[PDB]
Structure formats: structure tokens, C-alpha cells
Amino acid sequence: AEMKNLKIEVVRYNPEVDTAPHSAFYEVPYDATTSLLDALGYIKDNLAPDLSYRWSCRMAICGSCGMMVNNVPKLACKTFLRDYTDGMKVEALANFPIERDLVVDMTHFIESLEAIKPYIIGNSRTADQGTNIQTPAQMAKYHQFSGCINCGLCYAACPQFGLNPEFIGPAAITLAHRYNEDSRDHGKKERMAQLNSQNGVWSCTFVGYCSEVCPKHVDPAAAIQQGKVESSKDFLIATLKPR
Amino acid sequence: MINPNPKRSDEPVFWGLFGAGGMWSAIIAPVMILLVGILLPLGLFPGDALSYERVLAFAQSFIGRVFLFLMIVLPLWCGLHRMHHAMHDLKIHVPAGKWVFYGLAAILTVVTLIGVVTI
Amino acid sequence: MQTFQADLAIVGAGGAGLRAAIAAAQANPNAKIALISKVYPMRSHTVAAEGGSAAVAQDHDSFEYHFHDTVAGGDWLCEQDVVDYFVHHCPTEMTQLELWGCPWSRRPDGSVNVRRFGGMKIERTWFAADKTGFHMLHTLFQTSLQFPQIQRFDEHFVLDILVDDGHVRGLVAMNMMEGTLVQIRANAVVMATGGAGRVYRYNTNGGIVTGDGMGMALSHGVPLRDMEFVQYHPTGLPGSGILMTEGCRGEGGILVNKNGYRYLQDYGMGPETPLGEPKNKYMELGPRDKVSQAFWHEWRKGNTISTPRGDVVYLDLRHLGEKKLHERLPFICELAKAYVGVDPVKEPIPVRPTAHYTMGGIETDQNCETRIKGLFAVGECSSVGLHGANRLGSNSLAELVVFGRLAGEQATERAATAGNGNEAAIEAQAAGVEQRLKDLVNQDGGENWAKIRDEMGLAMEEGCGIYRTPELMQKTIDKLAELQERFKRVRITDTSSVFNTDLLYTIELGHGLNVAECMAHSAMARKESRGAHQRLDEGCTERDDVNFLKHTLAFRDADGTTRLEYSDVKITTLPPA
Amino acid sequence: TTKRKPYVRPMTSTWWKKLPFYRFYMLREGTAVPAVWFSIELIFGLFALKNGPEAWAGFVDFLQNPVIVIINLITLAAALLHTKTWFELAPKAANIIVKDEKMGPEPIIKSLWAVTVVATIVILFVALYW
């Protein structure tokens, strides 16, 4: 029994020692089923115990798996060594500050996600009265956008967020759009202020590469466009607003 | 870290015209560039169809008065709005860029309105 | 150490933990609540659940039917007064989740749709498509943001809890990014750390599921209850162990040997049902335990297909068709294509039994309270007495929101009437946690933690499978004890402060080793077969209600030895038979 | 004192050269240049046609220049790229459900091309035939 080998480039960084990130190369055995996450594990156990990374689910559902692979945002979780036969380079998730090795500071994300108030607002129904009534039709209005797992992959992909850190971002607008379009939600006016901002929807120039990298096929770029149309509608109403 | 009360963007207005400017141009521009750009100076047209006499007859008429205006004005607003963002995309710093580009647009829009009412 | 003040502290950002936070914030608007987790809340393992949440909704259903299903399914190791409370609060809790915005699947008339799971006669399971766990957690998490009472310690690792004079008074935790230590003082603490599945080599569990919460309870003289009962899921991918939902079988998928002969008819699960028409309790909808066992029976005969990743059975679904897959099973398709290189349209998927759920856990009374005053356990890390010898499919999620609410509400009562403990003693208790940390770091002797991890998993895999023998249970007990001594010769070669996972994983392996020993001793001591725990030695083939109708309690003493006691089982309205 | 020192990677002006996807986006925005250029030329024509037959004759001789033909050829190629891309993106603006499924943008892309196809001929007919 003999398994084929691969030389993987991993970009390492230690705040204690390193001034800047530098590369380190590791010979790692692989087969048809070996994921990047598997390979990272192998290094930690045998080649280097000082390697750090985030992961949990092992199956592209948790989202803590984000990183760069040959300048591409991917989840190590679902990246396969069989594909990168020629060579492979693993950097920390782009557009984010590097805390350590492959571990990044994702405060802005969480905070952007917070700002939009992603929860049911102003529905006074109580439990002992049974559920709301929502038709499969009414549901298909927001359903796709509800499936986001906060991977961060879209933020790394978005050039605009690269140029502007303050921009609330695709994932965040998408989630705001999710509740806006929910038949059970009466908090549309609560989260428009953020979306109407320049750091809101009006930082997207419809590049669309975020929709391209989404592992969960949310298509956040469409949420933004709909968001721009909705913001325009609001702007119009607000122009005639001196009541 | 994130502003509780942000300023409403003025963007919807520029974006509004940009949308119509983009649509008009996608639909009508190809055929127009064909006529004016290629057919006319190569002379590839049947008889006296694009002669000074006939073009003027359309130009002076009310329908062609509105048409020429929109064919010129709308695509500018689309085009210029884009260049304004290209600057920011190329990390090129243009002072009062906003006013510069839309300033240009308004000027020409006026020049054309002036043109289509005849001089 | 920086100190913190809080009315109560919840350890774990999973479904149950979040439910507890929300409940406490509503029970008291002025409370200051500390929500601690080693990962960002949305990464908790609850995110991985696909099937659904059991709650009664149908006209022709009854709470008695759900009660009977669970008690019988738990093979009469259920605290019947607890099960009763449970069934009655499911409707209320699931509805509340809908109210907060959970996208439950619907009937054409806009009402809530239910589907069948876990062998229940009347299908009462509510489901958010194929993403029920993802939806429940994200709904619970996004809702918690509207409450300023909850202060969250993201990526914070909890080392030990603070006890004096039989009362909890706080905890010790480490900021993961900084590597700094912090005290949090609260007069009530809720444990929501999930199960211990990661202690087995092949599992369906996320990396984080390492048995920490139980490991802390043990060290403070709290027993772990019914730890020998471990649930295997019949269909997981080979090597990785990735779950394939029962929904696949629920749509009419088949299990076959190397000869493509549907093997389930052999073991009393006959007669064979038509492809399009799958019947509950027959063939592929046969009981969790039976199907699991059947694989092992077919394994013995040399009927299993052999892959470089292990011996497998085939779940054929390619005979289903495109349109059927996409409406209820689209996730499964994408898993198959990526992980095993299989299209459930073109080819068969390799699968096998895989270690899934922890029925055992920290001992709790009807209130989720431990023997230590002010300490609570809820969720998979706990043992409320609901599941008994075996867990009914889709009851775990239901428990999280039902008992999460109760845990959260009771802890708020206990915090208010707690009074004050001895300041000097508590502080000294926390000093000793830090000293114990320094002690591990100074440790030397060149043992790789990884190799000790790998060997424990192998031992649990071979020692505590579906079928169990005294020879093999002892071999494991012996192995673990050897590893216990070996753990003392490990050196953590990384000394870095910032996000040092070398240190973390090694500590997590600690709690693992401890817990595995509780499973192993309990299993050995129970000389009968009941639910998940099955023995082959003579006189242990059948369930013994005469001698073994009692809960197993596992204690770890100061000398490092695992002691056992037995508690009686509460039976309110339904006698054993 | 904290022991962590967060490292921020920069973002160059040439960020778009690195990936083929970005390059295409750049180019799509690059259509705006010729789009302005043509709209400019029409101003020339409007004024030259206004100044009388003599001035218009010189405006035509300007277009007779090879460079203008070449630059206008590029302009048409540019307009055409805009069309293909605009039609791909606009449909993502409306979120419409037919029955119980969110409708695809494929039927909309069709509608737009048809409207262009009919518009082109109808215009070419009026322009050339009479």
C-alpha cells in the first residue's frame, strides 16, 4: 500500500515572532477523497503542532472553514487535493486582518450582521394562538436568502469591501433583505436606514463575484439589486414625505 | 464601530437615470452606431435615404426632435456614472469627482436641448 | 485574572444554550447574562441536524401517543414524570420558534406541515426543509441579538467551574484570541456543551463535540448517568462518518449487500416492500437498533462490499429520480457527489453504521439541577431522564427548546435566592485552576497528543460497538487506563498565546479520556441487554427488568477511579412490559 | 499589554489584473468610454447638420477617415458587449414567484433580446427603405 504525495504551500504568521507572513511547505499524502481540511489536520498532528485554523462540521454547513486557495475563497472543508495536482497555496481569508496563521478577525462581519436587526419585528401574535399563516408561495419570496451560513467567503470575494472596510457587506444586506421580504415581518422601516447609507447597498457596483463563490448558493448579488430598487422606492416616498 | 444613524445616500437619483440610460443604449445603440458610424460614410444605403435633405427632414420633425435628444442624453448619464466609479475602482483620486462628471452630463444635456430646439 | 459580574452564566452557544439565554432574559429583563462559547454561536453542532423537531400538531394525535412512543422507545429507562412534562410543552415551543421566524415547511393552505421520523406511528415532526438544525439555531441566534441582557463571550474556553459549600459561585474561562484567563462570578451556571461523540474514532459529530461539560461535572463529584447508552446512526459515509438523513429512507431508498439483495427481510423486518411504496416499521423503516445490528450480521457473513475506506452497504437512491430528490433531499445529493464521488442519479452511495448521539450525560432532577446547588445541565450533555436506554429520532431538537426554556427559567429563580458564599475560598479555588494550567504546560516527556487521541477512538470503536463482549469491553477499559497514565507524559510544544489550539485540543482530550472511562465501566457493569447497549455473553442476551431496571451512575474519585451507583426509575402511569 | 498584532494586507490599484473574473468586470465597465464617445459624435452631427449643407458635408468627410471607421467599429463592438451583459444582469432586479417557485431570469433575457431584434429591424426599415 502506497499513497501519492503533494507539496502544499501554507502561509504562516506568528504575532509573537513574525513581522509579516511567510511561506512554509509541507509534503502531505493524499488520495481521491482527501479534503484540504484533512491535509491541515495531518500537518498539525505530525509535521507542525503550532499550526492554527478554524473548523467544526466537516461538511460545509457550519461555515468556520474559510480560507484562500490559489487566490480563491474556498472552504477547506470541501476543497479536494485531487483538484490541485500542479501546486497549491493556502492563505488566510482575504480582506480580513490576520490574527494568526489561518485565523482571521471577523468582528466587522458579526457587527454588520448585528446592525440590520435580523429578527421578527412588530408582530404581536402570541404562542397560545397557534402559528402564523404563511403560504408556500409567500415563503418562496425570501427562502433562498435564508440559507446563508456566515462563511464570510463573499466578503473576501467582494472588491468593494476590499477597497472599503466600512461597507456593511453582501451577507449582511442579504440577511436584511431576508426579513424585509418575510410576510410575518413588520420591521421594514427599522433596517432601511442602514441600507440607504452609502456604506449600505450603494457600495455594490454589481461585480457579482460574491454570488460566484457562495458555497450555499444564496446569490447575495440579487438581494442587493432588489435592495437598491427598494431603497429607491423609499427615497421616492421620502421625497414626497413632508406630511 | 458602526454608525447608529447614517446619512441617506443621494445615489438613487443618479442610479435612476443610469438604469434608463443603460436600457435605452442596450436596445437602440447597436443599430444607431451602424447607421451613423458605418452606413453613412461608406455610402452603403439605397438612393437618397441618408442625404443632408432627408436627415434634416427627420431631425426637424417633432418625433425626431425627441428621439435625437434621448439617443444622445440618456447614454451619457449611463456612461459618465460608470466612469465616476471606474476612478474609484482604479484608486485614482479626482477632486470633486461627483460634481465633475455629473457637471459634464448636465452641461451637454443643456447643449443638446439647445440643439434640438434648433439654433 | 480579570473578574466579571453576572446574574447567571451559560456555557455553550448551542441550541439549548441559546434557548436558555432567551428564556432567562424574558423571565428577568434586568438580569446580566453571560453566554460563553469556544466557537461563534452559529458554528455549534446543532447546525448540522436535518430531520426535524418532534411536536404534536395533528387532530387525530394525542399527547398520550407521543408519551407512549418515547417511553417504549427508551426501553423503559425513562423518568416518566419528565417525559410527561416534555410532550406537553413541545407544541408551545415549536410554535414560539415559528413566531420568531423559523421557516417551517408548509401545507398549501399555509399551515405547518409534518413528516414522519424516528419510528413514530403518527407523524408529528415539524421540519424546516432539509435544514432544520441550521434554521433552528440561526433563528434562536438572530433572535437573541434583540436582548441587551445577554453579554456574549465569543471564542472563550472554559477550564473549570467554581464551587464551595455545595454551591456554584462562578467559573474560569480563557479568552482564546488573547490567551488570557478570566473569572466570571455568577450564583447559577447552565451547562450546554453537547455530547461526547468525538470520543469514538468514526462519528457524525463536529470537531467541537469533545465532552468538556461532562468532564467538569465529573471532577466535582457529580455523577454521569446512563453513559453506556450510545446511539449509532445506521447510515453514515465511510471514513468521514458524515450523516445521511433518515429522510432518504423516508422517501423510499433501499439498503443492499454486494449481491444487491435487500438484506433487511432476513432479520424479521420482512416481507419486502415495493420500491415506490415504503411502509413504516418494515424493511428500511425498521427500528434504529435492528438496522444497525443487521449490518453487523451481514458483515460477519462476508456479504459487505470492501472499500479502501472500510466495509460498506449500498443505499440505492438512483432508482428515485431527479425531481423527487430536489424537493426534500437536495443537500444529500451534493454531499454524495463531493465526498464519495457519487451521483444519486447515476450510481450507488457507500454507507455504514456510525457513532451518533450521547444518551448519557450530567445527572439532573426534574428542574435540570445537579446535586450541586445552582448548577444546571441541559441538552445533549445532560441526562434529564427523557431518552432512557434509547433516543427517539427527532426528540433531541425538541428537548433543546423545551428544556432550554425550563433550565433558563429555573436558574433565574435559583440565582435570586442564592445569598453570598465565602469570598476567600472561591478565589483560592480559582487560583488552583490557573496553577493546574501552568502545570500542564510545564509537563514534558514527548508524547504526541494526536497518537493518544487516535488510539482512544480505536478502543471505543472496537470496545463499545453495537455488539459488546466482556473480553472486548475489558480490553478497552485496560487500554484507556494505560492512556490515562500516558496523558501525563505529553508535551505541548507550542507555547504561543494567540489562538493556541495545540493547548486546547490537548485539554479537550483530557475530558474525553475521563468520559470514555465512564462509558466503558458502565457498559461492563450492566450485565443485560437494553436498547443501544447489547451484550453477547450468556445471560446478557435479554433485558432484565428484575435486576437492571435502574439508572447507572458514574463517579470519578480523587484517586482517578470510576465508581458506580444505581438509582431507581420513576414510573407514573405506564408499568414495564 | 496584548500579545497579538493584527496584520492587514494592502490592496493595490492593480487588484483587478490578478483574477480573470475581475478583468471581465473591468472590461464591462470599460464599455462606458465608447458609449460617451458616440453620444459626443451625435452632438457634432446635430450642430453640423444645423449649420447647413456645407458643414454637414465636412462632418461626413470626418467619418470617412479610416481611424473614425476603426474607432467606430470598436464602438459598435463595445455597444454590443454592453447589451449582452446588461440583459444578463437586469433580470436579477425583480423577484417574481410563479405558482410556488421563484421564477428564473431566462425568460426575461429572451424578452429583451426579442425587443432589441424587432426594434433594430423596424428602425433599419424606416431609415433605409424610404
Ligand SMILES: Cc1cc2nc3c(=O)[nH]c(=O)nc-3n(C[C@H](O)[C@H](O)[C@H](O)COP(=O)(O)OP(=O)(O)OC[C@H]3O[C@@H](n4cnc5c(N)ncnc54)[C@H](O)[C@@H]3O)c2cc1C
Ligand atoms: C448530523 C446530526 C443530525 C442530527 N439530527 C437531528 C434531528 O434531525 N432531530 C433531532 O432531534 N436531533 C438531531 N441530532 C441531535 C441533536 O441535534 C443534538 O443532540 C443537539 O444539537 C445538541 O444540542 P446542544 O445545544 O446540547 O449541543 P450543541 O448545539 O452541540 O452545543 C455545543 C456548544 O457548546 C460549546 N462548548 C463546548 N465546549 C465548550 C467549552 N469548553 N467552553 C465553552 N463552550 C463550549 C460550543 O462552543 C457550542 O456552542 C442530530 C445530530 C447530528 C450530529
Ligand code: SF4
Ligand atoms: S452569502 Fe454565501 S458566501 Fe456569503 S457568507 Fe453567506 S454563505 Fe458565505
Ligand code: F3S
Ligand atoms: S462582489 Fe461586491 S460589488 Fe456588489 S455584487 Fe457582490 S457585493
Ligand code: FES
Ligand atoms: S468545517 Fe463547517 S463549514 Fe467547513
